[PDB]
C-alpha cells in the first residue's frame, strides 16, 4: 500500500453523521444510568453517561449540570461539569482527561491533565490544561506538547508553555517552544509559529544543507515572504564554508494578467576563491539574474521573457542553481512580444547571448527581430501564407560585420487528397535583402569579400507525395492491423552564390527520419542550400484490436541529383561523395506493453562512411517510484569534425565525439524507503561522466533525503585530464522521487 493509506490508519476517522449549521440550538440528549437532582436547576448524572448535541460527544462517569439565571440575560447560563473518564469527541478534535468543564452557551470546554488528537489529520500531544474557545476556533493548551507523528511513534515533538491552535488561521502558535527529537530537546525559542494548514504564510522555510567539493559545507535558510495572493518572495542566505561568505539568493514569483513569471538575483558580496584565481580583478563579486515570464493576454498578446546573466563565465561551473547547469556553453537573454490571432501573428523579439568561452567571445545578437506570418486558406483549391522577417544583427565585438536582413516568403500550396493518398505541390519565393556595414576588418583579412548590399531571390518548388496501405496481421494476434505509408518528396531550390553574406544565423541541422522531408539544409536564413533531391521514406505501424499504435518503424533516404551548394562550402566531409543516396535515417518506437517501451534512431551518412548519430532507450516504468531506463547516444568523430567548430576536431575533450551508455533506475524498499540511481558512462574513454545515488526514507511525519552526484565539471588544460565534482546533500521535510531523478546534469527524461 501507499504511505497515504498507511498513515490514515492511525488517524481517527469521523464515522458519525456530520451536522451542519449552528449546534447551539440543537436538542441535548443525555443517557445516564441514574439521574438525581432538581431539574433544570441542578442535574447530576452518574453511570455510563453519554451526551449528544450534534457533532459533539461527551462521555464521563459522573456529569453535573448546573443552570444559573444570570440577571439581565434572557438565556440562563448552562454549565456542564464532567468527572471521571472524560472523553470529548466531535468532528474536529478528540479530548481525553479525568476532569472536564463545559459552557454550552459559548461552547467553551476545559479539560485538566489530558491528551488530544484531532480527527481527519495527523497530530496529537498532551497538555496540563486544555481549553476550547470561540466556537472551537482556538485550541489553547497550557504546558502542552504537539507533534505530527502517529500514536506510538516518538520521532519528534514540540513542548511549549502556551500552545494556541487557531483553526481558522491554520497556525499553531507555541510559546516557550522547545523543539524535541524524541526525549531530547534541541531548539528552544521564546515564541514559535507552525503553519498547520495550507494557507500561505511568511516565516522561515525548513533549512537544507549540502556538502560539495567546490565549496565544502553549505547551508540554505530560506525566509519565505508571502507578499500577497499573487506575489511571493524567498530570500535564502546561502553559506559556503570554503568561500567564506554568504550568497543572497532572492526569488520573486508573481502572477498577473500578463502571465506568471519568476525573477531571481543571487549575489555574493566577495569571493575568496575567485580572488585567488584572478588576483588582478578589481572586485570579486558573483551575481546571477534570471527572469522568466510566460503569458497570454486576451488570447492575443503573448509575452515571453527568458533572461539569464551571470557575472563571469565560470559562474555555473562554481555555484549550482536550478537556473543553469555546469553543462552550459552560454546564457540566453531573450524577450518577445507577440500578437497572434487566428490568421496572423507578428512577434517582435530580441536575442542576446553570453558565451562562457575564452576561445572566441564574438557573439551575434538579433536586436530586434520581427516575425510576421499571415495565412489565408481557401483561395479556391489552393492555400497561401506570407512569412516576413526583419532582423538586425549586432556583434559583441566592434569589428565583426553588422547587418539588417529583411525576408519575405510567399508560399502557395495546392493540397490534393483521397482515402489512400495525398500529393501536395508547393511553390515558394525567398526574397531576402541584406545591408551589411562595418566590413573593413573582415574584408581586409579574407579573400571572398562581403558586399555592402545583397539581394537573394530564389524559387523553391516542392512536391510531397504519400500513400497508405493496410493489412490484417493474422500471423500476429487475431485482429492486429498493419499499415505502410511510403512517402516520397521532391524538392528544388536553384543555386545562388551566398558567399558574400556572413553567416549570422545558419547552422547545419540534423537529419533524423522526420527531418529528411524538411526543405532546409541550414536553419536560419543566411544560407539556403541549393537542392535538387528526392526523398523516399516508408513508415510501418502495427495497430492492435483497439487500434492503438503498438509499433512504428521508418527508414528514409535522400537522393541528391546534384550537390547541395551554398557557394560557401567549408564543411569537411570524409570523402568526395556528392550525388546519390548520401543520407539515410531510421526511427522506431516499440510499445512492448503498458509498462515497457523502446525507442530508437540512427542517421547513417555515406559522406562520412560511418553512422553519424544513433540513440536508443528501453524504459520499463510501472510508476514514478519503480522505473528502470537504459539508453545510448552516439555521434561519430566525423560528425563532430564536420558539424561543430574547427577546434572541436582537435581538442582531446571534443574530438572523440559521443558514445554514452547510461542507466537510470528507481525502486522502493520496504515501501518506506526509496533509491534513485543514474550512471552515465562514456564508452570511448571508459570514463564516468555522471552518477547519483539518492536515498529517501518517507514516513507519516518526516521524510529525509540524501543525494549524491559525481559529475564532469570542466577541463584541466595543464594535465589534460578532466575534473570531477562530488555533491552530497541532505534534505529534511516534515510530512520526492521526481526531484531526485531530475537533479543530475543529465536529467531523467521519460520515454513513454
Amino acid at each position: 500500500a501507499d504511505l497515504a493509506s498507511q498513515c490514515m490508519l492511525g488517524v481517527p476517522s469521523y464515522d458519525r453523521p456530520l451536522v451542519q449549521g449552528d449546534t447551539n440550538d440543537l436538542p441535548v440528549t443525555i443517557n445516564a444510568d441514574h439521574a438525581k437532582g432538581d431539574y433544570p436547576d441542578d442535574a447530576v448524572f452518574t453511570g455510563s453517561v453519554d451526551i449528544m448535541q450534534g457533532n459533539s460527544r461527551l462521555q464521563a462517569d459522573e456529569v453535573q449540570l448546573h443552570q444559573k439565571e444570570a440577571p439581565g440575560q434572557p438565556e440562563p447560563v448552562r454549565t456542564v461539569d464532567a468527572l471521571g473518564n472524560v472523553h470529548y469527541d466531535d468532528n474536529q478534535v478528540i479530548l481525553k482527561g479525568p476532569k472536564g468543564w463545559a459552557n454550552l452557551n459559548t461552547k467553551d470546554t476545559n479539560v485538566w491533565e489530558g491528551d488530544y488528537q484531532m480527527v481527519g489529520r495527523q497530530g496529537r500531544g498532551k497538555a496540563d490544561l486544555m481549553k476550547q474557545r470561540g466556537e472551537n476556533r482556538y485550541t489553547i493548551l497550557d504546558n502542552g506538547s504537539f507533534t505530527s507523528c502517529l500514536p506510538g511513534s516518538d520521532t519528534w515533538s514540540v513542548v511549549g508553555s502556551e500552545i494556541i491552535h487557531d483553526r481558522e488561521e491554520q497556525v499553531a502558535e507555541i510559546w516557550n517552544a522547545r523543539f524535541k527529537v524524541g526525549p531530547v530537546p534541541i531548539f528552544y525559542s521564546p515564541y514559535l509559529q507552525l503553519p498547520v494548514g495550507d494557507k500561505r504564510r511568511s516565516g522561515f522555510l525548513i533549512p537544507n544543507a549540502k556538502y560539495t567539493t567546490t565549496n565544502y559545507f553549505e547551508f540554505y535558510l530560506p525566509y519565505y515572504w508571502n507578499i500577497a495572493p499573487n506575489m511571493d518572495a524567498t530570500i535564502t542566505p546561502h553559506y559556503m564554508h570554503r568561500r567564506g561568505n554568504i550568497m543572497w539568493e532572492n526569488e520573486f514569483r508573481y502572477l498577473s494578467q500578463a502571465g506568471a513569471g519568476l525573477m531571481e538575483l543571487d549575489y555574493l558580496p566577495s569571493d575568496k576563491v575567485y580572488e585567488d584565481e584572478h588576483p588582478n580583478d578589481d572586485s570579486s563579486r558573483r551575481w546571477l539574474f534570471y527572469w522568466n515570464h510566460s503569458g497570454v493576454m486576451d488570447q492575443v498578446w503573448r509575452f515571453n521573457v527568458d533572461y539569464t546573466k551571470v557575472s563571469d563565465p565560470s559562474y555555473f561551473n562554481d555555484f549550482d542553481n536550478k537556473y543553469g547547469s555546469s553543462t552550459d556553453g552560454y546564457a540566453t537573454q531573450k524577450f518577445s512580444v507577440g500578437y497572434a490571432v487566428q490568421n496572423f501573428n507578428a512577434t517582435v523579439s530580441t536575442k542576446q547571448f553570453q558565451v562562457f568561452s575564452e576561445q572566441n567571445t564574438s557573439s551575434y545578437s538579433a536586436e530586434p527581430q520581427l516575425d510576421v506570418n499571415y495565412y489565408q486558406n481557401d483561395v479556391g483549391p489552393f492555400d497561401t501564407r506570407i512569412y516576413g522577417q526583419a532582423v538586425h544583427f549586432v556583434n559583441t565585438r566592434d569589428d565583426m560585420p553588422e547587418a539588417t536582413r529583411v525576408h519575405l516568403e510567399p508560399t502557395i500550396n495546392l493540397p490534393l487528397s483521397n482515402n489512400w493518398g495525398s500529393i501536395n505541390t508547393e511553390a515558394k519565393l525567398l526574397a531576402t535583402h541584406y545591408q551589411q556595414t562595418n566590413l573593413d576588418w573582415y574584408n581586409s583579412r579574407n579573400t571572398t569579400k562581403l558586399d555592402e548590399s545583397v539581394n537573394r531571390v530564389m524559387p523553391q518548388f516542392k512536391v510531397d507525395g504519400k500513400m497508405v496501405f493496410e493489412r490484417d496481421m493474422e500471423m500476429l494476434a487475431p485482429g492486429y492491423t498493419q499499415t505502410l505509408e511510403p512517402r516520397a518528396q521532391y524538392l528544388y531550390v536553384p543555386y545562388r552564390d551566398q558567399s558574400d553574406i556572413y553567416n549570422y544565423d545558419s547552422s547545419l541541422l540534423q537529419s533524423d527520419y522526420s527531418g529528411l522531408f524538411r526543405d532546409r539544409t541550414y536553419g536560419g536564413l543566411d544560407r539556403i542550400a541549393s537542392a535538387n533531391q528526392v526523398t523516399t521514406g516508408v513508415t510501418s505501424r502495427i495497430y492492435d484490436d483497439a487500434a492503438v499504435e503498438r509499433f512504428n518503424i521508418s527508414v528514409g533516404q535522400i537522393y541528391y541529383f546534384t550537390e547541395s551548394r551554398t557557394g560557401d562550402d567549408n564543411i569537411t566531409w570524409e570523402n568526395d561523395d556528392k550525388t546519390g543516396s548520401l543520407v539515410w535515417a531510421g526511427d522506431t518506437y516499440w510499445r512492448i506493453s503498458e509498462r515497457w517501451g523502446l525507442r530508437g534512431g540512427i542517421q547513417y551518412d555515406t559522406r562520412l562512411d560511418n553512422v553519424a548519430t544513433s540513440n536508443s532507450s528501453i524504459e520499463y516504468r510501472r510508476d514514478e517510484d519503480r522505473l528502470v531506463q537504459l539508453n545510448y547516444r552516439y555521434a561519430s568523430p566525423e560528425y563532430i569534425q564536420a558539424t561543430l567548430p574547427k577546434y572541436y576536431s582537435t581538442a582531446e575533450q571534443y574530438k572523440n565525439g559521443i558514445s554514452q551508455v547510461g542507466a537510470v533506475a528507481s525502486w522502493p524498499i520496504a515501501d518506506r524507503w526509496s533509491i534513485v540511481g543514474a550512471y552515465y558512462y562514456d564508452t570511448n574513454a571508459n570514463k564516468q561522466a555522471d552518477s547519483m545515488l539518492g536515498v529517501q526514507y518517507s514516513s507519516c511525519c518526516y521524510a529525509i533525503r540524501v543525494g549524491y552526484e559525481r559529475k564532469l565539471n570542466g577541463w584541466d588544460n595543464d594535465k589534460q585530464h578532466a575534473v570531477y565534482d562530488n555533491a552530497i546533500g541532505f534534505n529534511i521535510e516534515l510530512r520526492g522521487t521526481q526531484e531526485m531523478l531530475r537533479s543530475n546534469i543529465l536529467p531523467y527524461q521519460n520515454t513513454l
Binding site: K199, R201, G203, P229, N230
Partner: peptide, 11 residues
C-alpha cells in the same frame, strides 16, 4: 516558520 504554495488571483 513559513509555508510556500502555488499562487492564485486575489479574491
Amino acid at each position: 516558520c513559513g509555508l510556500k504554495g502555488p499562487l492564485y488571483f486575489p479574491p
